[PDB]
Symmetry: D2
């Protein structure tokens, strides 16, 4: 029977809580979703509602586009939304393992993006560490992760990066020096970062993990877009094994190709991760969870695994093509072998004329429908939530050159690289011709 | 021309930023949505993406159900999502005015539910008031609003309510006594509440507003489900006129009949409300905004206004039917004329036998597909985030009786009341027969 | 259990094959559709296809919009599409009874519109009556019903209508005179018509039925848009009781408010109706059947019955408003009490100036977004499939005046009448002002 | 601008009426569809309707799933549906050329399946040839094409096929012998067939075309599933060049992977093809046209061309795998090099035991979710619409053996062949073990 085949797949999902090897057909998926939504009281045919939160919906466009999941995630009032939440977190745990953190103990989807999800971690740790006022943070010029600390009501302690060749790396001496200066009890946590813009590289998590274990200080990893990278994930896995990592947080959109809106908070200590979940007040949107559930069931392990493999290949393709273009314009690819996602070519040939050529190149790429490229000048001064950054965008006060960023992130296609290379070549020609 | 008629409506929305008098046809709405999504870079036909957040989508089910809005709300990378956000906040401001707060200066949708949205207000006020550690809070037995204070890292100062007849009301003397005891500078804010479970009533906002203006302390109003009530909204409007209200927060789902997930933060001081918006780190889900935009454009002013009128009528219908049932079972409707949404009938005839009959009645209603009713016993002890509540569910340590809650909230139908009355009558009969 | 409630409704549909009293919720309907489509082999998860008609679908937009019903209607290859067809025909039979033909024996949806469905009836009757070459047809100026006879390969025998007051009615003497002239065996059938443009009225079916019973000649009724009228349906029911009706055919779109595309063929002799079904070669589109199934399950008996009641009320409203306008312009409503759907006001005040004012009025209404009105002049000569019609549009060679048609058909709203009246008034004023 | 890029594609479609080289994104397609539907009067915001066919829709599920195309295909009342029809027929003409008939003059989508579309051709030819009563038809055991002739009211003249090796081929002598016997004027047309079940092969169209040109008799080609085959299409193209072909008809579902429901009628004489279109009475469903428009715009030339290439490859794969299996069971692949889509392996090893093993094998494959296979026994007697077929299913009275059919049709995947081979192998083993 056709129906039994669908039920077999559903039952296997419910009993194991694992991503199916092969992606489900849409037919199976929509059957499952409809049966789940049937379990929510708002969808009961015999229901009457006499409360203030009945999951009533005025617009049929709204109800249908959400598969009639209205109540969000948590006698129960929403048994299907609850099961949706359970399944999705179970699927996500298994993908975390698949992706490289095999010892992960616990995780949960939270329908806030990565910044606010990090804030939630910091808000939870306040009650663990009432004496703490500082968060030690190796510098990365990204506004949201930096603001997350201020939002949580702590003061960031910005640790400048060390220039090693072309790469910007964790200053481990300065981190330990600030712990000793300020006092371990006054530090809320170390806030490290994996995936980042080249020529910065993922933080030295093993070493920071050792430092945190020894000084007895929480370690929170901004893994925003590092789940897609088995190298970034090995760094988390190794760090947890050789020292201390308390939580790692990753974006749903950047690693799973779904709308912006949600993140995953994961860790190795189940009671602690539960404490973060419990620190969240009230119901939350089920929409990020639904998007990731749809995506993971449709892809299967094999589909997600293939996406990860294709990204590695696109990275190789992107670097070989960008290095070739760079060199053809008498530029070079910065040597950043410790960054597995992001790369940078120098813009020395257009910089230095005092005509804003580097910024102009960025705008030119933008108006030619190139998105995601970052033209980083020398000398941006920018103040973010109380803190003034010298050399903003470059993660250092005095990086030796201007450069252009590009990145091979999950779902990148060959036409992404090809069109980029084509339009970048033309833009470089225009600028240089203008400078004569 | 047919197309010009659609464009006229769209252009009028864009130029005035106001809810159309009559609801748009779905045809107009979907035209508009598709044209908006066209403005996001991920949807550009000529686009190439070389960054880490390109709004790529693996699942067609996911992309389509969100109308291809992927990037969430904020060179720009997402011009349509940005315009969506602008329009929606403008529509919401106008509905706030429509609903009873005509002097509202500023507001924004935040894709967190009401609890976390209140937390965000408290997180913002931390930077305004570094010496503050306390939030003064007239008691309401609702976990999320209470937890919001703890999550923000403040300690709640629980002010017990005064029993006046059957109603539980703001103890204004105790509020002022705690301000003086603890010191104005050590108070982060007063956290009041409008719409609530009977026999509690909306807080005395005019008087609290006067107190807050005089002691120079912020006033944050939990208006979770009070937007649907012109009486609750008059209380906010009057309070702002005679004293101080800094922010008022309301649920999207409870006032607009959309999925759980979002809230509105509004106020009378534009710079301050902007500061709360700016305290939020990173991008956020556009899904709550989209749901409310769809809903408000489809309803129009006239449709939303009609929903508000129908709720008032359903309240009258619900109370007349519940009073009639109560009296037929030798119970009574508690006299709560200061609560415009929630009501309560006594359960004295089944309580007092030491057999858990009140709790049992609640479960009986639940298993008979009645949702939203609250059977409140005498004597619940419950600890929430560090604080132990006596008489939990009843908003007081010694409320004189057990009672049952019901409420006429927006979108309630006559069959909601009728089925409820029918099943409640049968349940009361069963319990009483059992007690002989 | 929520799911059991849905299954109860489905099971009741499957066991009785009758329209539910109250409309199904969309949730129940889509559950049912998905479960049905599961029964088609193309949707089997374990299926392999090695034939030429496997129901493969390239476009996900196409597959989804049809609920994955691909195979159309008929070891079996399509068990769900087959069950869909069975259910839909059973629902339609019951609506035919509801609508006024309680003795209907058999019917089937055919995914051709009414013209081709009549052709199919004529094609079937060819094999019953090999000597027949003529179809006797009381005149109605509608191209499709007339062409249906030619398409079938018969020659129409056009019987002119009798003017009785303002109405055009069946010339029963001329019908019988042509039977006798041509010979009963040489007549394939009588092709009568119910719902039609005023001032024509439904054919005299009782009398024609008696004639057909006596001369032993098939009687095929064009009931294109007469199902929505209990008066038109009583005429079919009475005619079948007092004489002979072999088949009656009605449009799906005009009586059920669904896309153009399908029709119903019904009758009182089950073997004969089966013969028409069997005369159709090959598979056919399931789309008309699906549309009517969705519509009838969502409406229920009560919803469809309410639509029929509202149409009667709109007819009264339309005539009272049109009579009032007519008289205000010194025109009159033609006295057509035997037409229950269509009406006509005279255009004598603008006609007669030899300036094409009547045609011009029709175009003016069209450019002012009035659809469905017919401005009928005196003196249209028009040739349709070999036959030249004098006074084309007016169903007679010498109807005494020009007039304007309007009709109250199912789903008409008060704003349809109101806007029509408003724009018609303005148009009449413009024309008369021009004629000075 | 993003919007201009979409409009450029649309404008190019409208000006050239040709399939885009590369498939449109869904975004572009749905934009286009929505803009088209805007042009139909039922969708006009300012519209009032006072007629009997206003395109009103009761169900939002129905309206939305058809993109608000309600009126079907034809002052005008439906300008967008009309343009839809125009575009689709233009796209289809170009695909006919792409597929191998480069000299095609005219074609149109008709929303009837292939059988009824052939009937329409025969119905049209009746008026061209009033003396004709016969249709000469080389035998193919397919019920719908045979019934199409009877439905049209003609008598089929069944020409038995000639056995050449393993193939069944056109008996050209018998065709000419029947023309001479019955008289050219009494023949309505020759009804030939291209794509068919092996071991029958496509009719000898060049030779039949010469015969038809010489005797002055119409030639109607059943090209039901031959459009997907450049060899079948070359036969039509060559036949038209060396002789007479008046119309060729093909299934939409079998060549374009859309629901059953529609067909294309094409030819080389534009006035004649127009005459067939004009012989159709009334409006018709736009749904088949919409499905093929969606499909062709999403695929582009390149996508459809790739599908055709993949089918050729799947044919090679299917035959090599089926030949290998056959031989492993001491059977053989029948030598049918003139059939480019269908193949047959002998079932001699299980046939001959008088135990219905051949029929049983067919049922076994069916219950193991193999669809589209045909187990053809020796000796089926079956009467279809008045005519008794000896050896029904095998296209001859005395085909030497029982065999099994399989076919590589458009959209076939490797798993279709692989699973089929796997399950067929197991079934053969079961049967042979049972026969000991």
């Amino acid at each position: 029977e056709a129906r039994r085949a669908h039920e077999h797949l559903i039952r296997l999902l419910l009993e194991q809580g694992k991503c199916p090897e092969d992606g489900w057909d849409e037919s199976t998926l929509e059957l499952f979703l409809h049966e789940l939504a049937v379990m929510d009281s708002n969808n009961f045919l015999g229901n009457c509602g006499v409360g203030e939160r009945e999951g009533r919906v005025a617009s049929a466009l709204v109800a249908r586009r959400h598969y009639r999941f209205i109540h969000g995630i948590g006698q129960p009032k929403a048994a299907g939304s609850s099961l949706l939440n359970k399944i999705t977190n179970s699927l996500v745990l298994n993908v975390i393992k698949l992706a490289g953190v095999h010892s992960v103990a616990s995780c949960f989807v939270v329908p806030m993006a990565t910044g606010m999800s990090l804030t939630l971690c910091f808000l939870t740790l306040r009650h663990k560490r009432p004496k703490a006022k500082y968060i030690i943070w190796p510098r990365i010029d990204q506004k949201s992760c930096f603001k997350s600390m201020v939002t949580a009501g702590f003061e960031p302690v910005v640790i400048e990066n060390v220039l090693e060749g072309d790469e910007l790396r964790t200053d481990l001496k300065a981190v330990e020096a600030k712990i000793q200066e300020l006092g371990p009890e006054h530090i809320l946590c170390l806030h490290s970062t994996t995936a980042c813009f080249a020529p910065r590289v993922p933080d030295r998590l093993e070493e920071l993990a050792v430092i945190c274990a020894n000084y007895d200080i929480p370690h929170v990893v901004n893994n925003a877009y590092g789940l897609q990278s088995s190298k970034c994930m090995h760094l988390i896995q190794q760090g947890a094994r050789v020292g201390r990592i308390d939580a790692f947080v990753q974006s749903l959109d950047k690693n799973f190709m779904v709308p912006v809106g949600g993140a995953i908070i994961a860790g190795f200590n189940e009671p602690f991760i539960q404490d973060i979940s419990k620190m969240y007040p009230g119901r939350a949107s089920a929409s990020p969870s639904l998007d990731v559930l749809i995506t993971l069931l449709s892809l299967g392990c094999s589909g997600y695994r293939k996406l990860l493999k294709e990204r590695k290949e696109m990275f190789v393709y992107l670097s070989t093509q960008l290095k070739k273009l760079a060199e053809a314009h008498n530029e070079r690819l910065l040597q950043t072998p410790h960054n597995p996602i992001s790369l940078a070519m120098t813009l020395k040939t257009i910089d230095g004329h005092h005509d804003k050529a580097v910024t102009q190149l960025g705008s030119m790429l933008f108006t030619r429908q190139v998105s995601g490229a970052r033209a980083v000048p020398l000398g941006n001064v920018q103040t973010v939530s109380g803190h003034t950054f010298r050399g903003f965008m470059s993660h250092a006060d005095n990086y030796p050159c201007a450069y252009l960023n590009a990145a091979a992130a999950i779902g990148m296609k060959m036409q992404d690289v090809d069109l980029f290379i084509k339009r970048l070549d033309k833009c470089l020609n225009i600028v240089r011709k203008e400078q004569t």
